[PDB]
Design an enzyme around this catalytic site. Structure first.
Site, PDB file in Angstrom:
ATOM      1  N   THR A  16       0.778  -1.291   0.054  1.00 15.20           N
ATOM      2  CA  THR A  16       0.119   0.112  -0.111  1.00 15.20           C
ATOM      3  C   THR A  16       1.002   1.303  -0.098  1.00 15.20           C
ATOM      4  O   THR A  16       0.327   2.418  -0.624  1.00 15.20           O
ATOM      5  CB  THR A  16      -0.999   0.107   1.282  1.00 15.20           C
ATOM      6  N   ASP A  39       3.057  -7.360 -29.051  1.00 16.14           N
ATOM      7  CA  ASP A  39       4.046  -6.329 -29.359  1.00 16.14           C
ATOM      8  C   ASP A  39       4.957  -6.644 -30.187  1.00 16.14           C
ATOM      9  O   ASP A  39       4.504  -7.160 -31.359  1.00 16.14           O
ATOM     10  CB  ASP A  39       4.784  -6.084 -27.860  1.00 16.14           C
ATOM     11  N   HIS A  69      11.044  -4.404 -26.697  1.00 19.57           N
ATOM     12  CA  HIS A  69       9.874  -3.970 -26.373  1.00 19.57           C
ATOM     13  C   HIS A  69       8.893  -5.201 -25.774  1.00 19.57           C
ATOM     14  O   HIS A  69       8.646  -5.341 -24.625  1.00 19.57           O
ATOM     15  CB  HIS A  69       8.998  -3.305 -27.146  1.00 19.57           C
ATOM     16  N   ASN A 161       1.245   7.565 -23.857  1.00 18.87           N
ATOM     17  CA  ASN A 161       2.490   8.220 -23.403  1.00 18.87           C
ATOM     18  C   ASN A 161       2.179   9.707 -23.717  1.00 18.87           C
ATOM     19  O   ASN A 161       3.336  10.182 -23.775  1.00 18.87           O
ATOM     20  CB  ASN A 161       3.855   7.833 -23.416  1.00 18.87           C
ATOM     21  N   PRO A 175     -13.842   1.406 -24.202  1.00 12.27           N
ATOM     22  CA  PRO A 175     -14.243   1.294 -22.807  1.00 12.27           C
ATOM     23  C   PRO A 175     -14.372  -0.170 -22.109  1.00 12.27           C
ATOM     24  O   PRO A 175     -13.980  -0.246 -21.024  1.00 12.27           O
ATOM     25  CB  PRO A 175     -15.857   1.874 -22.629  1.00 12.27           C
ATOM     26  N   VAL A 177     -12.254  -2.475 -22.424  1.00 12.52           N
ATOM     27  CA  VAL A 177     -11.026  -3.278 -21.941  1.00 12.52           C
ATOM     28  C   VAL A 177     -10.507  -2.453 -20.700  1.00 12.52           C
ATOM     29  O   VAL A 177     -10.971  -1.778 -20.094  1.00 12.52           O
ATOM     30  CB  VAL A 177      -9.957  -3.189 -23.038  1.00 12.52           C
ATOM     31  N   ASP A 200      -8.979   2.861 -16.220  1.00 12.37           N
ATOM     32  CA  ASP A 200      -9.677   2.074 -15.319  1.00 12.37           C
ATOM     33  C   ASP A 200      -8.660   1.782 -13.981  1.00 12.37           C
ATOM     34  O   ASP A 200      -9.290   1.739 -12.848  1.00 12.37           O
ATOM     35  CB  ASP A 200      -9.775   0.621 -15.813  1.00 12.37           C
ATOM     36  N   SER A 224       2.903   1.795 -21.964  1.00 11.31           N
ATOM     37  CA  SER A 224       3.605   0.356 -22.479  1.00 11.31           C
ATOM     38  C   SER A 224       3.932  -0.476 -21.415  1.00 11.31           C
ATOM     39  O   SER A 224       3.979  -1.741 -21.406  1.00 11.31           O
ATOM     40  CB  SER A 224       4.518   0.684 -23.441  1.00 11.31           C
ATOM     41  N   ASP A 260      -3.941   7.042  -3.552  1.00  6.77           N
ATOM     42  CA  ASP A 260      -2.393   7.017  -3.271  1.00  6.77           C
ATOM     43  C   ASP A 260      -1.758   8.147  -4.219  1.00  6.77           C
ATOM     44  O   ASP A 260      -0.589   8.343  -3.946  1.00  6.77           O
ATOM     45  CB  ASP A 260      -2.017   5.735  -3.307  1.00  6.77           C
TER      46      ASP A 260
END
Length: 279
Positions: A16, A39, A69, A161, A175, A177, A200, A224, A260
């Site tokens: 946490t 990827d 990647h 990014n 939405p 996913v 999300d 990514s 947080d």
């Protein structure tokens, strides 16, 4: 049980408070589950995968990850030193060239390949698709991810990014996913991380140590790099029987460390991926 001096991102999703270095996880480690890393491919022969990575498809002249990647994100998903789900099975889907840039028609075909390829694979615990890419908005790219999601794959995707609202990016803006934003070591939103309402959940995505091509390791940053943490986390949670594929995204949101993260714009969720592991 515990991985001492783990990468900060693995230690983060297991606590946490920030600043920790130990990754606490159930022994399950994503066993019985599968994750499709879509990827640049995977260097399956990286000994950090222990034979648990294999290329199942490419859309280019060869299957090898000439970029780094994919094997990085595969490593964050399930390398046994840098992986959330250290026992998961990883499949490589090379939709991105060794330059890290593919067409949407190729990315779409990759998503529908996985939607059918999973049917000839053993994944008694569930199927994830870490989709560590993104581009401008596309309804069809969005449609392919939703098709992949409705096919029974828990799809995790990076917010992008661009430091903007992820609504203008695909499959970040689909939405259904799991649109993953990037955090940093100090519980700040990464400077590059997209945001918005479609997001999300947030993943550790700044300065992420994971496997590389050539048997190496590398530390890189980007949303990514955040989505492998979530897709690994979902592969981990799916194995534990906590959630299905179609429900893992909102499960990770309900059990996330809430509030947080700093520098989270109003409207964007202040949740951070968390396995809630009790030893």
């Amino acid at each position: 049980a515990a991985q001492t001096n783990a990468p900060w991102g693995l230690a983060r999703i297991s606590s946490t408070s920030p600043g920790t270095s130990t990754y606490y996880y159930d022994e399950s480690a994503g066993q019985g589950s599968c994750v499709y890393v879509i990827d640049t491919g995977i260097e399956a022969s990286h000994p950090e995968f222990e034979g648990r990575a294999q290329m199942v498809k490419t859309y280019y002249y060869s299957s090898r990850d000439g970029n780094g990647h994919g094997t990085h994100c595969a490593g964050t998903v399930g390398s046994r030193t840098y992986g959330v789900a250290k026992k998961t099975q990883l499949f490589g889907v090379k939709v991105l060239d060794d330059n890290g840039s593919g067409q949407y028609s190729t990315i779409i075909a990759g998503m529908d390949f996985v939607a059918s390829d999973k049917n000839n694979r053993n994944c008694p615990k569930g199927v994830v698709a870490s989709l560590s890419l993104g581009g401008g908005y596309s309804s069809s790219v969005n449609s392919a991810a939703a098709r992949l999601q409705s096919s029974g794959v828990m799809v995790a995707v990076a917010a992008g990014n661009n430091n903007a609202d992820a609504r203008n990016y695909s499959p970040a803006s689909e939405p259904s996913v799991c649109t993953v934003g990037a955090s940093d070591r100090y519980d700040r939103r990464s400077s590059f991380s997209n945001y918005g309402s479609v997001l999300d959940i947030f993943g550790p995505g700044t300065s992420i140590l994971s496997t590389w091509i050539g048997g190496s390791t590398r530390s890189i940053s980007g949303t990514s790099m955040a989505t492998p943490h979530v897709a690994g986390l979902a592969a981990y949670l799916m194995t534990l029987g906590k959630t299905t594929a179609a429900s893992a995204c909102r499960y990770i949101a309900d059990t996330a460390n809430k509030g947080d993260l700093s520098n989270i714009p109003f409207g964007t969720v202040n949740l951070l991926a968390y396995n809630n592991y009790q030893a």
